[PDB]
């Protein structure tokens, strides 16, 4: 199947149609991007992520009661350094600017969504919902934010998924059968 699969050159084609194809300074709105877009502040952040990921990994069934409560304040601390660090790009950055880069949104939503958790997981029990707990995804999902730091895989995995969705209708036989 793979050695006789039909089309249905080609990187002259690709390289000669994909040849088609910052801030100002004025206000404490300089001095903020020159923080934020500092190489220091990118490494903190990443390294942040890998903490905010082992604390992740560090629950455990019938843990002391006391090494829960600080696994929640760690995530309260990780929680809010994420959303003073949302902050601060929503500042620096315009909004416009920042809602436009379909990751920045992402850090957006994961913040919120961490937030949202917090505050629902003091008050869960009023609410007795089935949708009580799925407001946890969120501070797994800040494990996404390595995606990106991986280059190559990034890529793979980029290339496959926009080929999966060049290919709306095989899924819709595998589903049909
Ligand atoms: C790349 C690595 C070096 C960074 C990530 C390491 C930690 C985030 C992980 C790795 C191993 C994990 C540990 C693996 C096994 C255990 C034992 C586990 O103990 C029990 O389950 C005891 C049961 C009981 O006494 O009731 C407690 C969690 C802990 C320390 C885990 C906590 C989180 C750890 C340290
Ligand atoms: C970096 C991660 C360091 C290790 C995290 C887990 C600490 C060990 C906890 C064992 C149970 C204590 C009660
Ligand atoms: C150009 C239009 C492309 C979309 C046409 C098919 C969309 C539906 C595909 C659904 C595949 C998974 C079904 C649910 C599991």
Known sequence: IIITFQEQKNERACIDFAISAPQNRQSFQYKTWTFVVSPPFEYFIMAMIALNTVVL?????????????????????????????????????????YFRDAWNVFDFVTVLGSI??????EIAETNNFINLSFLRLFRAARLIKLLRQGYTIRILLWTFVQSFKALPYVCLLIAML
Do not use: Q
């Open 57 to 97: 990994m560090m629950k455990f069934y019938d843990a002391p009661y006391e090494y829960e409560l600080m696994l929640k304040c760690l995530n309260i601390v990780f929680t809010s350094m994420f959303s003073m660090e949302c902050v601060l790009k929503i500042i620096a950055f315009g909004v416009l600017n």
């Open 116 to 121: 949202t958790d917090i505050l629902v997981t």
